[PDB]
Amino acid sequence: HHAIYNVEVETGDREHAGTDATITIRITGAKGRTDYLKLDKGSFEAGSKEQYTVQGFDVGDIQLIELHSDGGGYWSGDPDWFVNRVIIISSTQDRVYSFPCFRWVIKDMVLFPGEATLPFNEVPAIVSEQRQKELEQRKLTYQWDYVSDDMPGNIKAKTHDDLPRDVQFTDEKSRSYQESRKAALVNLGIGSLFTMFENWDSYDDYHILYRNWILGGTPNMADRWHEDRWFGYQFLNGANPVILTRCDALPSNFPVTNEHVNASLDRGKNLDEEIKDGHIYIVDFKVLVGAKSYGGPVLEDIGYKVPDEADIRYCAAPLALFYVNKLGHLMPIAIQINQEPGPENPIWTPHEENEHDWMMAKFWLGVAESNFHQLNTHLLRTHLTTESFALSTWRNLASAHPIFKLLQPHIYGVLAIDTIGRKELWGSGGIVDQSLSLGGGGHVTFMEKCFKEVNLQDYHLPNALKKRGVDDPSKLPGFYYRDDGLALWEAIETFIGEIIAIFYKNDDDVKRDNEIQSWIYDVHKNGWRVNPGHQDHGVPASFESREQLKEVLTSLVFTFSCQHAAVNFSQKDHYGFTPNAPAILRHPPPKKKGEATLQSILSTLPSKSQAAKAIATVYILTKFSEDERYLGNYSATAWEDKDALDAINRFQDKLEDISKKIKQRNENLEVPYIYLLPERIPNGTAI
Ligand SMILES: [Ca+2]
Ligand SMILES: [Ca+2]
Ligand SMILES: [Ca+2]
Ligand SMILES: [Cl-]
Ligand SMILES: [Cl-]
Ligand SMILES: [Fe+2]
């Protein structure tokens, strides 16, 4: 004759989560559906758990609910309502129904009870219809847009506030970001006054520049940047640990011989023998040829052609050779500043007659490294490329889908920061233009050039390390990015495998899942588009197995969290003392040996205000928000399935073990490697 429904609603704790809109709820089940019933006694504050008792038609077994908000009245400041979950008990049913949400309620929100499902799993027809309608609507809200033909697809949004609220920064992240921008302007202005009439005449002058910033500690390379051992160390454990490969033969255009490097070898063998023993490594920045730097110079194979106080910046495409010495230290042993060898682009070594020439060579290798790292390793290959997958998750996976639930905490952030970044950070005029040689426009062309070579197999850490020849700790010791990254790769892969096995019982279940198929196909066709001049991007058009699904999800999750953390949060230590890693140089490279002086070097190195702006950029890009959730913290995820909860438990406990092992390893290091501690790795790419 009627049922009594006990309704409990948990509102999210985040700022503005609450609402004063009038809320109603309609309940549907096997027997029919109630009317919209008022939940209108008391307030919905952030963090609240509020209870209601409403009476209506007995729907029998409950199958879905619909919340409605009237959107507030004249005085409502922020009617949008963030709902974590609704729990209902019906007087006629011996069951507790739990409806996870974790999304913003704007006007209407449909929710289903119980565990995640694949689209073909058996559910009431009205559930399947609502699921199909959700996804129709996703496609109108979440649309592809592109910087150019040669960039990965991004979310269509003019500014951050045009984004769907589910993918905007939380108010806490927007405050953390806007406050960081204000603090940077204040610290720049105070440091500008303090240093205004400073005679800039030594490398140690640059130490002033980080002193009035809250960076979490003096840059850990400030005291040792000038030592070859610590210069070499950072190609393993600094901000850009992705380019060094094992050298099994010198490139024909980098004609280093035993006579150039023998004074550096110290295990009793010559250069050819050390190459065969796997102790010789190399970096090749050839991708930077053709790069257009601010003020006009265009990099050639030979460097630059024989050209008041204009802002003119330079870069380089060097090769550099390194050697693992008998103590296990990676030492820099040769640098050629540009690609085409000869007298005007010679090989520089730590044994230069003129010590300033070797220091200048190391600075040219750093400028190439900085521009490559910021634009390719960090901006393109974390943010801009994984942004396509975040967009495709919203377009193609229903909120009921288990892989939607898995990805939510990891995709969060990237749409918001990238929408902001296109306007304020690496877009035209942004803080990047003030701080990189390739700023001014050349930085977009350069990312385009890099994106043409991008392949999804690059995001597979064990395969990429093996491919680079850097995975054998007996030949290449002291490589903590590799050690910690591989431990976390395995932990994430194990977890994802266990989630997949709960919902997909065999390969057929993958092939039949039209949403996961649409998801990968959307990236394949519209996300990482193989356009004229592009290599294949390694994105499959479909999934055929559980293992293939695991491998793509692991790559993606590991990149959003760990890889971004390793190449982003390492920036204070890498760049905070400018001479450790200059990102702008002001004169072209030398065309003969014996020229460099401390003074010609200081005039090539960034100006005080260029260096200050680099520090400011790093400060902004590396600020953790006070609401950040770190790796494995799934406190705001929508899981209900008991087995999924247990898989999460095992994963968190694994992460906890990896954390203690990293801290134990660190206690014996001269310079602890902390960027891959789980407690410092955000779930996502949000800054
Ligand atoms: Ca609100
Ligand atoms: Ca109440
Ligand atoms: Ca738990
Ligand atoms: Cl009713
Ligand atoms: Cl679930
Ligand atoms: Fe970032």
Secondary structure in 3-state letters for 563-620: HHHHHHCCHHHHHCCHHHCCCCECCCCCCCCCCCCHHHHHHHCCCHHHHHHHHHHHHH
Closest ligand to the CA of 644: 5
Q: Which residues surround ligand 4, an ion (CB under 5 A)?
A: 34-35, 56-57
Q: Print burial letters for 409-419: b (CB count within 10 Å at least 16), e (below 16).
A: bbbbbbbbbbb
Closest ligand to the CA of 24: 4
Calpha distance 493→74 (Å, rounded): 50
Q: How far is the CA of 50 from the centre of ligand 2 (A)?
A: 5
Pair 358, 409 in one domain: no
Question: Token pair 């040219």 is at which residue?
Answer: 364
Range of the structural domain that residue 251 is part of? 242-369
- Residue 51 tokens, joined: 């209870």
Pair 393, 497 in one domain: yes
Q: How far is the CA of 631 from the centre of ligand 3 (A)?
A: 14
All residues at 6 or more sequence positions from 653 whose CB lies less than 8 Å from its CB, including other chains? none
Pair 541, 616 in one domain: yes
- Residue 563 tokens, joined: 């890889």
Q: Which of 59, 87, 114 is the last residue of a domain?
A: 114
Closest ligand to the CA of 384: 6
- Residue 31 tokens, joined: 């027997």
∠ CA 406-84-173, nearest 5°, is 75
3-class DSSP assignment, residue 323: strand
Closest ligand to the CA of 114: 5
Contacts 24+ apart (CB under 8 A), 141-146: 141/394, 142/391, 142/394, 142/395, 144/391, 144/526, 144/527, 146/529
Query: 298 to each of 134, 291, 347, 363, 434, how far by Cα in Å?
Result: 50, 6, 22, 19, 18
Pair 178, 270 in one domain: no
Q: How far is the CA of 79 from the centre of ligand 5 (A)?
A: 28
Q: How far is the CA of 410 from the centre of ligand 5 (A)?
A: 17
Calpha distance 152→157 (Å, rounded): 15
The single-letter code of the amino acid at 190 is I
Q: Whats the size of the chain, residue-wise?
A: 687
Calpha distance 285→317 (Å, rounded): 5
Here the CATH number for the domain that contains residue 258 is: 3.10.450.60
Pair 294, 336 in one domain: yes
- Per the structure, how many domains does the chain have? 3
Q: How far is the CA of 54 from the centre of ligand 2 (A)?
A: 14
Pair 317, 458 in one domain: no
Q: How far is the CA of 655 from the centre of ligand 5 (A)?
A: 22
Calpha distance 387→383 (Å, rounded): 6
Closest ligand to the CA of 400: 5
Closest ligand to the CA of 2: 4
Nearest to 148 by CA among 489, 615, 529, 536: 529
Pair 9, 32 in one domain: yes
Here the CATH number for the domain that contains residue 22 is: 2.60.60.20
Q: Which of 337, 369, 401 is the last residue of a domain?
A: 369
Q: How far is the CA of 43 from the centre of ligand 2 (A)?
A: 6
Q: Is residue 489 within a helix (H) or strand (E), and if so which, with residue range? A: helix 480-503
Here the CATH number for the domain that contains residue 394 is: 1.20.245.10
Burial, 395: exposed, middle or buried (Cβ in 10 Å; 0-12, 13-18, 19+)? buried
> Could you give the dihedral angle defined by the CA atoms of residues 36, 40, 43 and 44, in that order, rounded to the nearest 10 degrees?
-10
Pair 602, 471 in one domain: yes
Q: How far is the CA of 670 from the centre of ligand 5 (A)?
A: 45
Contact present, 62 and 31 (Cβ < 8 Å): no
Experimental method: X-ray
The single-letter code of the amino acid at 542 is S
Contact present, 286 and 317 (Cβ < 8 Å): yes
- Residue 152 tokens, joined: 């990965």
Calpha distance 227→207 (Å, rounded): 16
Q: How far is the CA of 169 from the centre of ligand 5 (A)?
A: 25
Q: How far is the CA of 46 from the centre of ligand 1 (A)?
A: 8
Q: Which of 326, 345, 369 is the last residue of a domain?
A: 369
Calpha distance 245→409 (Å, rounded): 33
Calpha distance 2→53 (Å, rounded): 13
Sign of CA dihedral 641, 645, 648, 650: negative
Pair 133, 109 in one domain: no
Contact present, 556 and 489 (Cβ < 8 Å): no
Q: How far is the CA of 577 from the centre of ligand 6 (A)?
A: 20
Pair 354, 450 in one domain: no
Pair 251, 315 in one domain: yes
Pair 260, 336 in one domain: yes
Nearest to 245 by CA among 337, 319, 161: 319
Q: Is residue 105 within a helix (H) or strand (E), and if so which, with residue range? A: strand 97-105
Calpha distance 530→534 (Å, rounded): 6
Q: How far is the CA of 415 from the centre of ligand 4 (A)?
A: 41
Phi, psi dihedral angles at 436 (to 5 degrees):
-110, 145
